[PDB]
């Protein structure tokens, strides 16, 4: 009893009825996979500038 093996028939019609979506970009992307040495220093850089505005704007 042989049957069909594979077909991509109807697979693009199915993928388009819900309108293929772009990945919804954001400002401030995740720092996942960024170099740890840069990321470790960026933590200290953001802390200092947060204090700089805190000391001035208050």
């Amino acid at each position: 009893a042989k049957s069909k093996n594979h077909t991509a028939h109807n697979q693009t019609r199915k993928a388009h009825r819900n309108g293929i979506k772009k990945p919804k970009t954001y400002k401030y992307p995740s720092l996942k996979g960024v170099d740890p040495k840069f990321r470790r220093n960026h933590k200290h850089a953001l802390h200092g500038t947060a204090k700089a505005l805190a000391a001035a704007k208050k």
């Binding site: 993928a15 819900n18 293929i20 979506k21 772009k22 990945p23 996979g33 960024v34 170099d35």
Partner: protein
């Protein structure tokens, strides 16, 4: 049976160009990449490390990570009915700056120059690009250009 290895079906994809084998020239190593740069991916068969998969051949992405001898690139890949964010670690031999970003970065510069010139006087200086317009009417003269052409030619065997 079937074979679906990592570098399958890449016999011509990862070939070098004709008379362009050998060592990679130093320009690829002196190019500076930064996070946010838009880069094109084209693998070098001579460099087997940090080498992209055959899918990302010809794909354009944005640099998210800068490393010692490699670059992290963001590519959106279509899986099923949506796009998925993908992250590659590629040595600089396999990437280059996409030149499309540089003309756009010159158009924004030239847009600001035209707007600054138009600030004092002459507003509405057409910052936007326009498509090719239908041609305007013009006069064509026959002075030295009298029309003269034959009809379709008969059928000869030519052999």
């Amino acid at each position: 049976g079937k074979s679906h290895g990592y570098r399958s079906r890449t016999r011509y994809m990862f070939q070098r160009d004709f008379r362009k084998h050998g060592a990679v020239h130093l320009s690829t190593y002196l190019k500076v990449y930064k996070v946010g740069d838009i880069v094109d991916i084209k693998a070098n068969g001579s460099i087997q490390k940090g080498m992209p998969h055959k899918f990302y051949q010809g794909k354009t992405g944005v640099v998210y990570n800068v490393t010692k001898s490699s670059v992290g690139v963001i590519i959106n890949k279509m899986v099923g009915n949506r796009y998925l964010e993908k992250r590659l670690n590629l040595r600089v031999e396999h990437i280059k700056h996409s030149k499309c970003r540089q003309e756009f970065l010159e158009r924004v510069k030239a847009n600001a120059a035209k707007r600054a010139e138009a600030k004092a006087q002459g507003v509405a200086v057409q910052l936007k690009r326009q498509p090719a317009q239908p041609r305007e009417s013009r006069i064509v003269s026959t002075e030295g250009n009298v029309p003269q052409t034959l009809a379709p030619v008969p059928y000869e065997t030519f052999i």
